Every structure is written in C-alpha cells, then in structure tokens.
Design a protein around this ligand. Structure first.
Ligand SMILES: CSC[C@H]1CN(Cc2c[nH]c3c(N)ncnc23)C[C@@H]1O
Ligand SMILES: CSC[C@H]1CN(Cc2c[nH]c3c(N)ncnc23)C[C@@H]1O
Ligand SMILES: [Cl-]
Ligand SMILES: [Cl-]
Lengths: 234, 232
C-alpha cells in the first residue's frame, strides 16, 4: 500500500489502454513527454509516454525517475519477434537488455557495450518471476530472454542478419528497452520489459506492424495490468 | 547568465573543472555536475559518460537541476571534412543521428519520429565561436556534425556515414543526443569540439595519441567562448 509502479511506453497507441484504466488520473507535461499519475485498481502508478527511440526513451525515463521516484519500472509496448516459436500477440519478457547498435570494439569493449556500462543490463529477478506467474495464470504463449534495442526499425535484409549474427540468442528487437534499462541502472532502479509481438522484423515487418500493433498493445497492456496487481498483492 | 557545458569523458572536462572557482559538485544518476565561475562567468559543467543515452540522461539532469541559459558541447571528434587535422576545431551548424533509421515509415534517414530530421545550433552561439576562432588564429570548419553509438574506424561504418551524409564535417557519439534534449526544452546549443582522429582505419591509434591534444584545444575554445558570451 506504499509502492509506486512506473510504467513506460513509447507511442500513444502503446499506452492509451493503460492510461484509460487509471483512477484519479492527472497529467504532467514536461520535457516534451507526458506522465499520467493515479492508481491502477488501487495501486499508485506513474505512466510515461516517451516517444520513439533511445534518446527520447532516456530523456523520459530520467524525468520519470527524478519527478516521480517510482519503485520499479515496467516497459511495455510492441516488439519484433526473433525467437522461432513466437507469433504475433505473444509475450516477451526480458532477462536482460543490450544495444544491438553500439560498437566501441575498436577499444576492446564487447559488441553492444558502451564504455562505463556493463555489457548488458539485467532485469530484476522478482519482477521477472511475477511476470511469469501472470503468463501462467493467463495461459499466454511467452518467451523469456535477451531483448536488443537500436535506433532503427528492423525490416529484414542485413539489418536483421546483423542482429541474428551478433546476438544469436536474442528473442526480440525494439527501440527503447535498453535505453530505459541503462537509465534505471544508473539510478539503481529495478526494471523489467514485458512487450508483445507485432511483427517478426522481416521484409513485411512494416505491414505486419500496421495490422497488428493493436493486438500487441492489447496483449502487452493486459500483462502489465496483471503484473501491477501481482506486485501489489499476490 | 548561466552557461552549461557538457563533456562525455573525464579527460574532456578535467581542464575546465580545474578552472572553476566557487566550485561545488553534484552527484546524480551516475553523472557529475560542477557549478561555479569560469573566469568570472557562472557555469554548470557536466561529465556525462559516453554515447547517446548517457548524454541524454546527463543533459536532462543538467537542465532540470541547473537551468542553464544555453548549452555548449565540448570534447574530441573524428574529422570528416578534407581540411581538418588533429587539433583543429569543428563547430556545429547542425546535428543529426547517423545511425537512426525509421525510413520504412517514411521518415528521413537519421530522423526519429517526433523530431526534426536535424537539430540546428544557435546562430549567436555560432557567431561568438567563430569570433574566438578568428581572435585565436585557429583553423576550424563549420557545418554538420553526425552522432551515433559507434566509434568510427574506416571500412563499412565510415562508408555508410559518407553515403548518408556526404557533407558531414565530423562524427562523434553525444552531440545529437544533447541537441535533441535541448530541443525538447527549447534551450539553445552549439557544439565546439576538436579533432582527435579522422575516423579512418587507424582512428583508434590516433585517438589514443591525440585525445589530450583535442581535449585541450576544445577546452581552450570553450573558455574563450564563455568569456565572449558574457563580457562581449
Ligand atoms: C514507428 S517505429 C516503431 C515503434 C515500435 N517499437 C517496437 C517495434 C516493433 N517492431 C519493431 C521492429 N521490427 N524493429 C524495431 N522496433 C520495433 C519501436 C518503435 O517505438
Ligand atoms: C572511447 S569511444 C570515444 C569518445 C570520443 N568522442 C569522440 C570521437 C572521436 N573520434 C571518434 C570516432 N572516430 N568515432 C566516433 N566518435 C569519435 C565520442 C566517444 O565519447
Ligand atoms: Cl545472444
Ligand atoms: Cl550531408
């Protein structure tokens, strides 16, 4: 009864379902971002609409942390599925997050690692465990593992081949998760990424995205709602 | 008048940090900000760390906690324009991400949805920089500076930059993130960096050899620019 859960989403479509469920909602406009405060079935939350990309996600995560001091962070939204058993609508939960477009290897850093940061950012065990409890309880098809972020919308070709080569075990790719993990790391705040598949990052990922962003938003939102409740009570 | 200054590496901010009098340090989100006076002018100096996200986070804290009137981005850089040599100054007319690609949805290459394709540096800040450049007899080039989360080392990475931005005069890893955050807060910015390498296949070796030289040239220019902006 004294916990505040932070939730971050990039697009309007990705946060609108959660925003509409907030009781006593109030809006905070700042730094070009929007923060919606209130409760989700009695649980205090702070929902940030960040905008697309690493910097927008970083700027917004920083404002959310400074301004609302949430206890944990949940990143929601869509994603391009990379694991083989994933289908549109399926859930992906992060074990860890890495930049697939960072390269300071000329200096001896691991591919994807930036100087002064760990090669990858690890998601919180408890948060990950609660997300799986919800996946079991809702009987959804989900996959857990490494999620990679970059500032490009992956649409087949070499973009996708480069990723599969450098991160063979990556299960999904998107554009804000790792930026958020990075900010949470520097502020020492627990985070987890729980997104849903809207495409498979191949040559038609853009068309698939147009057709299924809605189901990914809906499925991701349902998961966030369940996770907020499980973290609040049990 | 309060002038904000951002540097990624400690080596890029150490000379400036040393000249700040009435100095105080704030430690937030893994970053450090040093407040005080640089030769009589109020400044807020931030050491952000390397790359876009680090720079974004740090810029956000600087603007939130110190509310500077303008922002100056200092440090080293990979030279792209043909007349640049190690030590030379580069001034941003504008900043663009060389590694952002959402063209599948119709945005310009380098453009992220919700942002202009490129961020324009402030004219007054640019003029003042140019006057310091002249007064000090420095060799400099003005124009487009491209940012990415990769250290450029010739080969394919350099070729891709040349393809998308044939007129980019230099490449680095924080400037456009700083520009993007300044944009969201309506703060003017300008980038004043010095060349440590020419982003070719031997850029690692050159950076190792000339980072200090680039740090000193850029710091000296920032120092002159601060004085000119506050005391004409
Ligand atoms: C309008 S640009 C898209 C928004 C969706 N977020 C996720 C995403 C789904 N499929 C992806 C893919 N194939 N490549 C990269 N990212 C994604 C990232 C961006 O905010
Ligand atoms: C240890 S990574 C490097 C620091 C230097 N800053 C500039 C820079 C100089 N030469 C560059 C090049 N060839 N490619 C990209 N960036 C740069 C960016 C990063 O903070
Ligand atoms: Cl992997
Ligand atoms: Cl160009």
């Amino acid at each position: 009864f004294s916990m505040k859960i932070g939730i971050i989403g990039a697009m309007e479509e990705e946060v609108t379902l959660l925003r509409d469920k907030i009781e006593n909602r109030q809006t905070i406009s700042l730094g070009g971002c929007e923060i919606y405060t209130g409760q989700l079935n009695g649980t205090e939350v702070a929902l940030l609409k960040s905008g697309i990309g690493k910097v927008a996600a970083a700027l917004g995560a920083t404002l959310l942390l400074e301004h609302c001091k949430p206890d944990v962070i949940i990143n929601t939204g869509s994603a391009g599925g990379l694991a083989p058993t994933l289908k549109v609508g399926d859930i992906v939960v992060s074990d860890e997050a890495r930049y697939h477009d960072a390269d300071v290897t000329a200096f001896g850093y691991e591919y994807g690692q930036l100087p002064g940061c760990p090669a990858g950012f690890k998601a919180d065990d408890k948060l990950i465990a609660a997300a799986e409890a919800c996946i079991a309880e809702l009987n959804l098809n989900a996959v857990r593992g490494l999620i990679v972020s970059g500032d490009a919308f992956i649409n087949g070709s070499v973009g996708l081949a480069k990723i599969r080569h450098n991160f063979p075990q990556a299960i999904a790719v998107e554009m804000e998760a790792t930026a958020i993990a990075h900010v949470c790391h520097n502020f020492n705040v627990p985070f987890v990424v729980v997104r849903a598949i809207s495409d498979v990052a191949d040559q038609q990922s853009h068309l698939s995205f147009d057709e299924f962003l809605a189901v990914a938003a809906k499925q991701s939102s349902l998961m966030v709602e369940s996770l907020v409740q499980k973290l609040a009570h049990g």
